Amino acid sequence: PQITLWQRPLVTIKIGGQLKEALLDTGADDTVLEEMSLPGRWKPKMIGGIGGFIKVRQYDQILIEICGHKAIGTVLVGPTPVNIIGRNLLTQIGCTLNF
Amino acid sequence: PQITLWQRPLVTIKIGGQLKEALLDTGADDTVLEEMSLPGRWKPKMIGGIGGFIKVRQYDQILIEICGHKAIGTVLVGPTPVNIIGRNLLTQIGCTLNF
Numbered sequence: 001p002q003i004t005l006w007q008r009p010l011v012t013i014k015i016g017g018q019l020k021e022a023l024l025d026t027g028a029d030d031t032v033l034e035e036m037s038l039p040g041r042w043k044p045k046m047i048g049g050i051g052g053f054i055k056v057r058q059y060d061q062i063l064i065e066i067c068g069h070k071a072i073g074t075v076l077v078g079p080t081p082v083n084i085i086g087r088n089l090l091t092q093i094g095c096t097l098n099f
Numbered sequence: 100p101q102i103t104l105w106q107r108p109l110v111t112i113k114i115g116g117q118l119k120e121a122l123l124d125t126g127a128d129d130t131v132l133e134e135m136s137l138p139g140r141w142k143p144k145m146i147g148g149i150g151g152f153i154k155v156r157q158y159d160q161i162l163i164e165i166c167g168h169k170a171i172g173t174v175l176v177g178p179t180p181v182n183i184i185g186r187n188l189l190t191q192i193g194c195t196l197n198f
């Protein structure tokens with residue numbers, strides 16, 4: 001589909017059998033979600049925003065459904081202001097910017 | 100044009116006659132640029148994201164050229180590490196997210 005930007009590009013995602021709201025964010029390199037439990041081991045990672053950097057937990061090969069489209073990739077969990085779907089997953093669902 | 104997200108969506112913008120590189124950020128409500136001088140009165144504001152908040156100066160009705168498309172809108176100026184073009188301006192150039 002085509003999403004306009006007059007309002008926040010919020011979509012429903014499914015992860016760990018739960019539905020959550022997330023922002024389609026072309027400015028983010030990675031996908032970062034609010035604190036939650038994911039399976040497997042995690043690795044440390046530092047990501048930065050306008051205010052500075054934060055430490056998050058990196059989980060790999062996580063199944064996440066975005067607007068019905070299934071994706072499998074790296075998900076970061078940490079103190080993020082909102083659930084963010086970044087370029088690593090946007091590319092998997094074939095998302096592009098057009099104008 | 101159609102911009103893929105394999106890499107960060109960086110574009111050239113023209114503001115105050117100056118050329119700059121900026122990130123197209125669908126997750127950002129507003130536009131925030133690195134410290135610079137702009138004519139007119141401004142209002143202080145606080146914007147936050149990953150890492151926390153930063154103080155910025157809000158200028159209204161600023162003319163900006165993005166990829167040859169003229170757009171008018173509010174621009175926030177502050178100690179941001181990267182120039183960010185948010186939704187307030189992306190809408191004016193008719194930018195959409197598609198997949």
Ligand SMILES: CNC(=O)c1cccc(CN2[C@H](COc3ccccc3)[C@H](O)[C@@H](O)[C@@H](COc3ccccc3)N(Cc3ccccc3)S2(=O)=O)c1
Binds near residue numbers: 027051126150
């Ligand atoms: C009202 N606030 C604004 O208009 C407003 C205006 C401008 C900016 C922001 C905040 N940013 C949002 C996220 O914050 C929020 C918070 C609440 C609601 C919406 C977005 C942005 O959309 C993201 O792209 C992330 C990159 O996050 C990641 C995630 C994973 C890996 C790497 C980055 N940042 C922008 C940024 C990009 C590159 C370098 C430095 C900073 S951010 O600063 O963290 C809000």
